[PDB]
Amino acid sequence: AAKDKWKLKQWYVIYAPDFFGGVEVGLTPADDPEKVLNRVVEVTLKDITGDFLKGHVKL
RNA sequence: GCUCGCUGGGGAUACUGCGGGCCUUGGGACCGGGAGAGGCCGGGGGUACCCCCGGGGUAGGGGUGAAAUCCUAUAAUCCCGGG
Ligand SMILES: [Mg+2]
């Protein structure tokens, strides 16, 4: 039954804000889309703009 | 010699005391550019920690030299969003 519970969940794609490019930053699972609101994701500036210098900047 | 103590007079003016004058070195007052977790009062913050509410997940967590009391299915330890 535990496995069955895990099968009810759908995966949602997370996008960066408009002025940062709006690119895809990841995927998160949930059964009800209302539970996705107010979740937070941490990404480095190197992930958005490719440069091996600003790897220590976290957004 | 001892009772080193008292008293009538004369002389000296280096030091101490007293009176007058004149100083700036000790001390104090004031002005300049700086130093400091010195003190008091008002405002704005930093992580950490404890409790409460909502989501996830499920059988352990904590603690000692070794254990046990203790906490946990009225859902803990752990992770996330708020107060
Ligand atoms: Mg809960």
Within 7 Å of a protein beta carbon, the nucleotides of strand B are 55-58, 80-82
- Long-range CB contact pairs, A3-9, < 8 A, 24+: none
Resolution for this PDB entry, in angstroms: 2.2
C-alpha A10/C-alpha A32 separation (Å) is 8
Cα radius of gyration rounded to whole Å, chain A: 15
Contacts of A1 (CB under 8 A, 6+ apart): none
C-alpha A40/C-alpha A38 separation (Å) is 6
Q: Hey, is A4 helix, strand or coil? A: helix
**Residue A48, Cα to own-chain centre: how many angstroms?**
13
Question: A27 to each of A8, A9, A10, A33, A36, how far by Cα in Å?
Answer: 16, 12, 10, 13, 11
Report how this structure was experimentally obtained: cryo-EM
Q: Tell me the CA–C1' distance in angstroms for A40 and B18.
A: 97
Q: Tell me the CA–C1' distance in angstroms for A39 and B38.
A: 51
